[PDB]
Design a protein around this ligand. Structure first.
Ligand code: PRO
Length: 258
């Protein structure tokens, strides 16, 4: 077995706490694991209204990677919206990335604008699917930004539907306001082929994700073919909680390969 340094990156409205089952298992196998709160997430002291762009939302990840000592590489693991953050990170620090794992995540490309897969996602996602999610607007650095805050039924039905009530309760207690920064992402420079396009990419898709359905995950793969693909059967959106052991086995193979 090869020793790797995994950096686990949560998705919208969530935090490092999402990784609380997987991180100890990876460490027991002997790896180094970092689980970050993105800006205004988890117990990060900022609120979403102070965040003016996806790059600021990603600041803890970029800051962590800037402090990596020379020669150290990491394996990024991003879940859901976290796939966007690891694109931003790879484009500034690709020399520090052994590989990027996309766990039922958004997988942007270099050909179209960074918000491309988020645009496609919204065109194929019925608006009814958001249930009691609350949407809101704020202004930052002169820009109007639309945020969202997952509600209890959305969480129950779309993200946690295969989780026990003890994990679901943690979500009701801990989810915070977030944003996709979609109009900010529309005016952003594309992801570069030299940076983000260079790093090796693994996609792990889930067969019961009712937040990002498998057909959309598969479309993303077709749109931007990654170096390796894995399938986790029986994983809901929160597959690091319902299929923890499966994912750890996959990440061991990745670390053994890259
Ligand atoms: O990042 C996440 O977890 C959210 C869930 C639905 C769409 N993306």
């Amino acid at each position: 077995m090869a020793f790797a340094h995994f950096v686990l990156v949560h998705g919208a409205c969530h935090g490092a706490w999402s990784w609380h089952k997987l991180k100890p298992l990876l460490e027991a196998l002997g790896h180094k694991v970092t689980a970050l709160d993105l800006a205004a997430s988890g117990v990060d002291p900022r609120q979403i209204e102070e965040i003016g762009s996806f790059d600021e939302y990603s600041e803890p990840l970029l800051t962590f990677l800037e402090a990596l000592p020379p020669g150290e590489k990491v394996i990024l693991v991003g879940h859901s919206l976290g796939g966007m953050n690891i694109a931003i990170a790879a484009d500034k620090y690709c020399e520090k990335i052994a590989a990027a794992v996309f766990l039922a995540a958004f997988l942007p490309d270099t050909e179209h604008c960074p918000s491309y897969v988020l645009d496609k996602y919204n065109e194929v996602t019925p608006a009814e699917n958001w249930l009691d999610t609350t949407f809101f607007t704020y202004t930052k650095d002169g820009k109007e930004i639309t945020g969202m805050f997952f509600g209890p039924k959305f969480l129950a039905h779309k993200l946690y539907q295969l989780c026990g009530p003890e994990e679901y309760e943690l979500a009701k207690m801990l989810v915070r306001k977030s944003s996709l920064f979609m109009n900010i992402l529309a005016k952003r420079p594309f992801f570069t082929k030299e940076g983000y396009g260079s790093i090796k990419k693994i996609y792990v898709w889930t067969d019961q994700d009712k937040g990002i359905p498998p057909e959309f995950q598969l479309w993303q793969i077709e749109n931007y073919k990654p170096d390796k693909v894995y399938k986790v059967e029986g994983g809901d959106h929160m597959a690091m909680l319902t299929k923890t052991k499966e994912i750890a086995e996959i990440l061991q193979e990745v670390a053994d390969t890259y």
